[PDB]
Swiss-Prot record:
UniProt PTM: Phosphorylated by NEK2. EGF stimulates tyrosine phosphorylation. Phosphorylation on Ser-33 and Ser-88 by CDK5. Phosphorylation by CDK2 regulates insulin internalization. Ubiquitinated by the SCF(BTRC) E3 ligase complex when phosphorylated by GSK3B, leading to its degradation. Ubiquitinated by a E3 ubiquitin ligase complex containing UBE2D1, SIAH1, CACYBP/SIP, SKP1, APC and TBL1X, leading to its subsequent proteasomal degradation. Ubiquitinated and degraded following interaction with SOX9. Ubiquitinated via 'Lys-11'- and 'Lys-29'-linked ubiquitin chains by UBR5, leading to its stabilization.
Organism classification: Eukaryota, Metazoa, Chordata, Craniata, Vertebrata
Residues of the full protein shown: 159 to 662 of 781
GO molecular function, one term: transcription corepressor binding
Source organism (scientific name): Mus musculus
Name of the molecule in the record: Catenin beta-1
Subunit structure: Two separate complex-associated pools are found in the cytoplasm. The majority is present as component of an E-cadherin/ catenin adhesion complex composed of at least E-cadherin/CDH1 and beta-catenin/CTNNB1, and possibly alpha-catenin/CTNNA1; the complex is located to adherens junctions. The stable association of CTNNA1 is controversial as CTNNA1 was shown not to bind to F-actin when assembled in the complex. Alternatively, the CTNNA1-containing complex may be linked to F-actin by other proteins such as LIMA1. Binds NHERF1.
Amino acid sequence: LLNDEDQVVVNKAAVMVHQLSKKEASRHAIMRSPQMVSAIVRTMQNTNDVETARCTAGTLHNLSHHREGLLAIFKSGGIPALVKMLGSPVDSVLFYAITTLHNLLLHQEGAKMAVRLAGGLQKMVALLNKTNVKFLAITTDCLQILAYGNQESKLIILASGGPQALVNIMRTYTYEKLLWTTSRVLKVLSVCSSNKPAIVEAGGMQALGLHLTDPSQRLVQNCLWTLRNLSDAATKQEGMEGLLGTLVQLLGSDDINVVTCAAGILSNLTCNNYKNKMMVCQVGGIEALVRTVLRAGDREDITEPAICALRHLTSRHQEAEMAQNAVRLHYGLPVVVKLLHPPSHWPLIKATVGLIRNLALCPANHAPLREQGAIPRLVQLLVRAHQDTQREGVRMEEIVEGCTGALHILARDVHNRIVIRGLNTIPLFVQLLYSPIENIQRVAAGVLCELAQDKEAAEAIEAEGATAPLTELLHSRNEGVATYAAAVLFRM
């Protein structure tokens, strides 16, 4: 435990320091002392001889294995030095630098702030165009460590072009450890409102889709979690066919986290996207989602997104009618009505009411929905929800609008109209005409319009004093409201 000096024009000093760092005995003596540790750093940070830099970086690396060696480099200002070396043209130096930084980030307290201040994030993002996978795996892990729970770092990663670079890695490499660490960076970034659209624009959804049948469960699951974050209100994408097919297959997985994510992504991607609705139906998505709901039982983390996806798939696309029938044909009607009952919570009830509204568009579903008891439960929901509004999550006004809307469609059928009227709903429907909410006025006037095609019901509506509020509604700025109001008035 002796030498501690050195001088300009000589680097045989470093070439002797290094070997001592291999032997733990001498290694503890050199790191217990803040003497030449600082004198190691200056060398590395300054010289233009390539072999001294790697000898210097190599030494710092060997010291990073011990709690005090980390402290040594840290207190000695090794972090800005190490970050500077991330610009080195020697692969061996780059590798020592990122690895030492990695060790500091893992164990040394204060290292993360120190790396951020030193401009580490920008340098690490810039290194994502390198081609060595073990190097990329360390680099992306440093980024995960620095980005997690740190919004500031996330925005810097975005500004530096992180999303495209990470997406390119997922589209390029097969090395599992690298794909997994890169997916964890994307997962962290995917909850940032700025990073999310950037990742989508980079083609991140399609890229993550590539890995959904990888043998590595941790890789699949991270891709799924990230996809669920990204898919929520994304721009319309091309080349989604493969991803959509795989998600439908994943619904049948024995892993509940896989099923939950698959349903949620399918829900997100099908919302108002008729192209995606079509593709999903074409690969048997209705059957798969119904099976998923049936198997899920009272697990609302699965049923809620699955029912939302079914709601999307049963509306407003070329095969919507086929889908409406398919829910019935795959034995789905009884469970859908069941989900309107306790123990279902409000989000699930809201989604289920919406699905039933779409299913009722299909005449062949009118009788089975009635037989399964959809009508009285929808009425009870509506009555209680209306009372609640008149006295954060789901607003009861949404349940009022939803149930009335479902009853509006079910009322196309003559037997359903008899049941609906038989439940003393006309007085409530008329009171809903007075609602502040145009959407509620609309379905209320709509259901009254269906009911009023039968003479006996037309008289009951008139007797309920509907004429006055309907006349007010003739002048509604909402053309749908005005049209239904005019139609009820006519039938009376």
